[PDB]
Amino acid sequence: ESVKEFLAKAKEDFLKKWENPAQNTAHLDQFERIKTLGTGSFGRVMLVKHMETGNHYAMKILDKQKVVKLKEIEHTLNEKRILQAVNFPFLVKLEFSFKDNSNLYMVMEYAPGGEMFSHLRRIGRFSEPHARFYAAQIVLTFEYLHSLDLIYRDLKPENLMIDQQGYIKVTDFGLAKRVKGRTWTLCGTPEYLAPEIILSKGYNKAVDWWALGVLIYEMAAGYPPFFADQPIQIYEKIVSGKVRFPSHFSSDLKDLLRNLLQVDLTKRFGNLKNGVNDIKNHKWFATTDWIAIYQRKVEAPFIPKFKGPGDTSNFDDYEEEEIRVSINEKCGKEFSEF
Amino acid sequence: TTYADFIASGRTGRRNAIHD
Ligand SMILES: CN(C)c1ccc(O)c(C(=O)c2ccc(C(=O)N[C@@H]3CCCNC[C@H]3NC(=O)c3ccncc3)cc2)c1
């Protein structure tokens, strides 16, 4: 019933799937490809329809050659191994995965409400209650992921899908990693990077809590706390850490954000002995029923308009490309475990 | 205003990750 209650069995389930991942559970010819919903470095996500069931899904297609070239094999293997092992209401569900001579495929649940990013940019900013509804789901999601020793490392509105009920599905696990203790890769999105990432220090799950501070600020303000035209200028602002707030931010919101956007690790909320409860019991979340959120019993502030299955009105248009499959297998050993 | 400065910036579209 509560998230903590769920965690007992959930960790056991996750570890079993993590240790013995599912492979090769569909084939490309089982899906009709409809429309591109998004792109990334090595490919794209398309709306597809599973011909046997008629169900719609969001299929990520990655070009193996492009991945190897840019030396991102391990991160792509992390993405799939983690996604196939997790199970949480606010995470996109992986339904199938497979590979062919050219590409890697992950067939995920389709979130027809589109990206939070789209709605946030259009509307400008969210009210504090609206932002708080979303933030609470992220707090619960990180409680889950962190309990499994997973760091997510790419929180931003672009990666927070909205489902038919107005709830979040976190997607794009390309930077997610299972690590006990510290890791060192300089990765993430500039606006969302914790100072310790930028300073090449070694870092832990506390970076996700820093990023939560950036997300809540951006949701409530309409712009992130640190922005500039060049990433290097953004990094300088982050390490300096001198956040200023809009005058419309409540006192409680500002206090929470000062504790999340905390450069000092012995002081950052989410990274103290009391863990997630420093955040859950903060005054800004006084109206939040954590069990009701987890059980999706709270009426969402925003429900996307949805004109039947396969409608994509909540997504931007992208240039379409033919999916090419070589007659020769590419990079087979590198992606053996996929 | 800060909002106007943001909207005039080069970082209001979808943001890419950086990566090793
Ligand atoms: C190491 N690098 C950074 C890396 C690691 C793992 C990866 O999968 C990639 C990729 O090449 C990649 C390829 C394609 C995408 C992609 O199109 N994702 C879309 C658009 C970007 C913003 N996030 C939302 C995402 N869309 C969805 O995931 C989605 C899910 C459910 N329903 C609809 C859509 C994302 C990443 C790149």
Beta-sheet strands, E only, within A152-237: 160-162, 168-170, 177-178
Q: Please give the Cα distance from B17 to A158 (Å, whole number).
A: 11
Residue A172 Cα to ligand 1 middle (Å): 5
Q: Are residues A161 and A169 in contact, defined by beta-carbon separation less than 8 angstroms?
A: yes
Out of B15, B16, B20, name the one closest to residue A186 (CB): B20
- For residue A89, the distance in angstroms to the closest alpha carbon of chain B comes to 25
Q: Which residues pair with A97 in a beta bridge?
A: A106
Report strand pairing: A168-170 vs A177-178: unpaired
Angstroms from B1 CA to nearest CA on chain A: 10
Residue A138 · residue A4 · CB < 8 Å: no
Question: Amino acid letter at A305?
Answer: K
Helices (H) and strands (E) in chain A, counts: 11, 9
Q: Which helix H or strand E contains A217, and what residues bound it? A: helix A206-221
Resolution (A): 1.6
CB burial string A29-52: b at 16+ within 10 A, e below: eebeeeebbbeeebbbbbbbbbee
Is the Cβ–Cβ distance between B11 and A229 less than 8 Å?
yes
> Could you state, in order of their start, the residue ranges of all structural domains in chain A?
1-20+115-305, 21-114+306-336
Residue A39 CA, distance from chain mean position? 15
Q: How many helices (H) and strands (E) does chain B have?
A: 1, 0
Which runs of E-coded beta strand occur in A208-257?
A: none
- DSSP lists the bridge partners of residue A47 as A35, A58
- Residue of A83, A171, A306 best suited for mutating to test ligand 1, as the one with most atoms within 8 Å of CB: A171
Q: Could you tell me if the CB of A111 is within 6 A of ligand 1?
A: yes
How far lies A202's CA from each of A23, A183, A205, in Å?
Answer: 32, 5, 11
Cα separation, A254 vs A245, whole angstroms: 7
Solved with: X-ray
Residue with tokens 């800004």: A284
For the segment(s) A1-20+115-305, the CATH number from 1.10.600.10, 1.10.1840.10, 3.50.50.60, 1.10.510.10 is: 1.10.510.10
Angle between helices A206-221 and A251-260 (to 10 degrees): 150
CA nearest neighbour of A12 among A134, A117, A165, A147: A147
Burial of A294 by CB count in 10 Å (0-12 exposed, 13-18 middle, 19+ buried)? buried
Q: If you classify domain A21-114+306-336 with CATH, what class do you get?
A: alpha beta
Nearest CA to ligand 1 atom 10: A40
Phi-psi sector, A71: left (phi>0), alpha (psi -120 to 50), beta: left
- Tell me which chain A residues have a C-beta less than 8 angstroms from the C-beta of B14: 117, 158
> Do the bridges between strand A43-50 and strand A31-40 make them parallel or antiparallel, or are there none, so unpaired?
antiparallel
